[PDB]
Design an enzyme around this catalytic site. Structure first.
Site, mmCIF file in Angstrom:
data_model
loop_
_atom_site.group_PDB
_atom_site.id
_atom_site.type_symbol
_atom_site.label_atom_id
_atom_site.label_comp_id
_atom_site.label_asym_id
_atom_site.label_seq_id
_atom_site.Cartn_x
_atom_site.Cartn_y
_atom_site.Cartn_z
ATOM 1 N N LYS D 11 -23.340 17.546 -32.761
ATOM 2 C CA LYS D 11 -24.308 17.215 -33.791
ATOM 3 C C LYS D 11 -25.736 17.070 -33.277
ATOM 4 O O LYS D 11 -25.967 16.649 -32.146
ATOM 5 C CB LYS D 11 -23.881 15.980 -34.580
ATOM 6 C CG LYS D 11 -24.166 14.653 -33.988
ATOM 7 C CD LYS D 11 -23.941 13.509 -34.976
ATOM 8 C CE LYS D 11 -23.969 12.210 -34.220
ATOM 9 N NZ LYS D 11 -23.859 10.973 -35.078
ATOM 10 N N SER D 27 -29.233 30.925 -44.278
ATOM 11 C CA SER D 27 -28.936 30.479 -42.921
ATOM 12 C C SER D 27 -29.793 29.233 -42.564
ATOM 13 O O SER D 27 -30.674 28.818 -43.326
ATOM 14 C CB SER D 27 -29.221 31.606 -41.912
ATOM 15 O OG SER D 27 -30.580 32.033 -41.983
ATOM 16 N N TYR D 60 -24.630 28.261 -42.153
ATOM 17 C CA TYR D 60 -24.357 28.635 -40.779
ATOM 18 C C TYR D 60 -25.631 28.674 -39.955
ATOM 19 O O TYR D 60 -26.728 28.803 -40.505
ATOM 20 C CB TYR D 60 -23.586 29.971 -40.728
ATOM 21 C CG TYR D 60 -24.388 31.162 -41.128
ATOM 22 C CD1 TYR D 60 -24.513 31.514 -42.465
ATOM 23 C CD2 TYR D 60 -25.014 31.976 -40.165
ATOM 24 C CE1 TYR D 60 -25.263 32.562 -42.844
ATOM 25 C CE2 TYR D 60 -25.768 33.051 -40.543
ATOM 26 C CZ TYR D 60 -25.890 33.362 -41.883
ATOM 27 O OH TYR D 60 -26.619 34.463 -42.306
#
Lengths: 115, 117, 115, 117
Positions: D11, D27, D60
């Site tokens: 993360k 994206s 993504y």
């Protein structure tokens, strides 16, 4: 470890049909599915550029060359005809392969004309 | 190292919700006959797509009595579906690409008093 | 085929803390994690009975016996202290095993008293 | 036949969005140094949890230039995050239970001008 990777995407297609009473799925010109590697009955995410809604359904084929993107069933509450959307599928694979993985991406403009 | 697809395993299309209770514990109880037809297992993750109100959520399936024709939305999900709502219930499974390319989902369609076709 | 199955759940716990500035996760009394088979750093779904919101985050451990359920970081926008929630984790396995799979379920009442 | 867990892989905590553009293609572009620190790969699925406005979405990752400190939300996701918003970006991986029980996520914390600690 197993990674989840973008398999393919149809970027900035326009919804051409949206009906609650038709099958609950997204029907997509087979030419488009071919380009993005997306399969009949595969899970897909739809990200709506026009209204910001994001949802998951599954793909089915529409007639080759029709340039159809039809969002049907419950999903018709999340997109309207004319809305610009991004359709994506994801696959999993081990890390070693994911590091060099290449997704299948097709970009669109105008009346669902693939560039 | 083969690439793994997420594919529709089965669906109960246009079943009607028969019970909804916020005070329950988090699940969707479904007539076992319906689970069989759609290939959905007890304790399996499911998506519910509400045709009536457009809400979409994920939970898991538990069996109701065979022949009861129950679709009971239990717990927090009762905020997302009410008695009378028409919903699609789907499960997804993963498999390699070659298998995915000839995969056939188990599909059951409903009408009337949760009568299967 | 590989199935996604409920691994475990904490049913009808109450949020005891919710702060945007604390770590983005849900901190859970280790006794509760033990009962439900939920792991430190595991993906979890939180389904909020009080306000109907549904979201996914990951679990971390809180002190054993504290009876804490702390929803922190961005997730603090989705739950408040006193809210009743259901916390679930899911695992995958082949169909043959999934057919007899048994999840780990703990039920709660009152002040996060496990029954 | 072993049971497979979904675990936080890594993360980027409290990074700030630097660019957002609805006209782009779907994206999130992220400084490659940041991807490295969090173990996140180009084209990997990610979740974004917006601390500023509470929105939560999945997209993504794609790489931005090393050292650019870019966090660019591209496409429909620009409806969910704006320049200046504080977000958490996470990826998840799957693994068997024994491995999951000792798994350590790659975590990078941010402050100031998307400065990593």
């Amino acid at each position: 470890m197993i990674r989840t990777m973008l398999q393919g995407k149809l970027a900035r297609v326009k919804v051409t049909h949206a009906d609650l009473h038709y099958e609950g799925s997204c029907a997509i010109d087979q030419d488009f599915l071919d380009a993005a590697g997306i399969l009949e009955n595969e899970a897909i995410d739809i990200w709506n550029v026009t209204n910001g809604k994001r949802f998951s359904t599954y793909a089915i084929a529409a007639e080759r060359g029709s340039r159809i993107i039809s969002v049907n069933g419950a999903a018709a509450h999340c997109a309207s005809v004319g809305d610009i959307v991004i359709i994506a599928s994801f696959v999993t694979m081990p890390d070693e392969e994911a590091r060099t993985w290449r997704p299948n991406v097709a970009y669109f403009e105008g009346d669902n004309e693939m560039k």
